[PDB]
Design a protein around this ligand. Structure first.
Ligand SMILES: Cc1cc2nc3c(=O)[nH]c(=O)nc-3n(C[C@H](O)[C@H](O)[C@H](O)COP(=O)(O)OP(=O)(O)OC[C@H]3O[C@@H](n4cnc5c(N)ncnc54)[C@H](O)[C@@H]3O)c2cc1C
Ligand code: NI
Length: 384
């Protein structure tokens, strides 16, 4: 049994960035993931987009943390950490006059979310087909926003963890927390993998468990929030001939849901999707189906008609964990235990927001933390 200051439960992007941030302090820190590898769940199955902030409601923590998180990625994290990424602008297209007035609404939303005017541009039919000649010519208008990036979220999450590990954070994989019980003395005992005796004794728990972030709070008798799900399947296609895209192309999300796209990918292929299905079991959050291809064909060819979906390489899926109560991010201590920090309901845009989310996690431990004078934030993930 290990005595440690903070146990981070969950090795997706949120757990990994948390480990990174905490690795800069003088603390005993351990991160636990149930899978053999990190980033095998929601953080593996998403579009990798660093969103501008045009999309989220300005009054929600999704907007708030988007704004902060993106700033931290571009001006801090990207300077220190090497992993694949590219700058690529956002383009939302309208198909009729109703979708067109939704573009105006989004424009205002971006300004409310502090996007500068120079980054935003409403475009006519003609101007949009100028910029992206492979888009559907039945579109009537577009909205272009500069400032977005696309990253490999898997390599980013791993880079963060390898960085953390380099600065004394213990990373234990194949380790599933199966019980937690807070003590008279204020610490927690943590059983993993249904073992008889506890493996950890810790002063704080940072709950980053994605689809099981509710399970985990209920298991410590700390908070009773519940998450629902939305499963999204994608397809990656290749060999599209002359087809080029110099934008991430999106449907109006207000009408078609969040993040519905055709994007050129870091590896030269095209990402199409996702579908949308509410309320799948937690265990089934990543299951692909035979139904979805058909849906995906309609989505992709609606946006880029010349797209040949039979040239498919892979299909995968992931699910947004969605707070039932607020349909927003949960970033707070548990309502009934101030030593259990909850990073839950981590839907879109949790990736973009991650760095700000996790810095708030750190403050929420509520400690006078002492820095290592020598702390190494730099890591270049070897890749090729
Ligand atoms: C289809 C889709 C598209 C998206 N697109 C974007 C996007 O373009 N841009 C953006 O900013 N965001 C996007 N998001 C949101 C983003 O992917 C998520 O916010 C983020 O990946 C959630 O990270 P996480 O670390 O909290 O969750 P997860 O990645 O799900 O990780 C949680 C970890 O905890 C582990 N775990 C659970 N229970 C236990 C336990 N008892 N013990 C040990 N480990 C446990 C799991 O194995 C796991 O790996 C998208 C999400 C989806 C579903
Ligand atoms: Ni407002």
């Amino acid at each position: 049994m290990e005595t440690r200051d903070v146990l981070i439960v969950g090795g997706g992007v949120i757990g990994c960035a948390t480990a990174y941030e905490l690795s800069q302090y003088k603390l005993k820190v351990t991160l636990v993931e149930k899978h053999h590898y990190l980033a095998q769940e929601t953080s593996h199955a998403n579009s990798g987009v660093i969103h501008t902030g045009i999309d989220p409601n300005p009054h929600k923590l999704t907007a708030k943390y988007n704004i902060l998180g993106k700033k931290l990625w571009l001006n801090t994290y990207f300077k220190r950490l090497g992993f694949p990424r590219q700058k690529i602008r956002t383009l939302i297209v309208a198909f009729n006059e109703m979708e067109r007035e939704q573009l105006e609404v989004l424009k205002q939303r971006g300004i409310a979310n502090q996007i500068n005017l120079e980054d935003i541009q409403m475009l006519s039919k003609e101007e949009t087909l100028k910029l992206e000649p492979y888009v559907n010519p039945e579109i009537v208008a577009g909205l272009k926003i500069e400032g977005s990036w696309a990253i490999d979220p898997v390599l980013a999450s791993k880079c963060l963890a390898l960085a953390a590990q380099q600065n004394k954070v213990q990373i234990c994989t194949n380790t599933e927390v199966t019980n937690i019980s807070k003590q008279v003395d204020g610490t927690y005992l943590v059983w993993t993998n249904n073992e008889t005796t506890p493996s950890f004794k810790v002063k704080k728990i940072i709950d980053a468990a994605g689809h099981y972030a509710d399970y985990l709070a209920h298991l410590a008798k700390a908070d009773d929030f519940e998450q629902t799900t939305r499963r999204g399947q994608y397809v990656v296609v290749t060999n599209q001939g002359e087809l080029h895209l110099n934008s991430m192309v999106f449907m109006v999300p207000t009408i078609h849901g969040k993040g519905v796209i055709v994007s050129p990918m870091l590896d030269g292929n095209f990402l199409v999707g996702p579908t949308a299905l509410d309320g799948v079991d937690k265990e089934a959050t990543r299951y692909i189906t035979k139904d979805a291809p058909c849906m995906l064909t309609k989505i992709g060819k609606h946006m880029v008609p010349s797209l040949n979906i039979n040239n498919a390489l892979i299909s995968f899926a992931g699910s947004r964990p969605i707070d039932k109560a607020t349909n927003d991010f949960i970033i707070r201590v548990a309502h009934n235990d101030p030593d259990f920090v909850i990073l839950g309901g981590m839907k879109s845009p949790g990736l973009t927001a991650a760095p700000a989310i996790v810095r708030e996690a750190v403050r929420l431990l509520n400690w006078k933390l002492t820095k290592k004078p020598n702390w190494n934030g730099k890591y270049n993930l070897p890749w090729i």
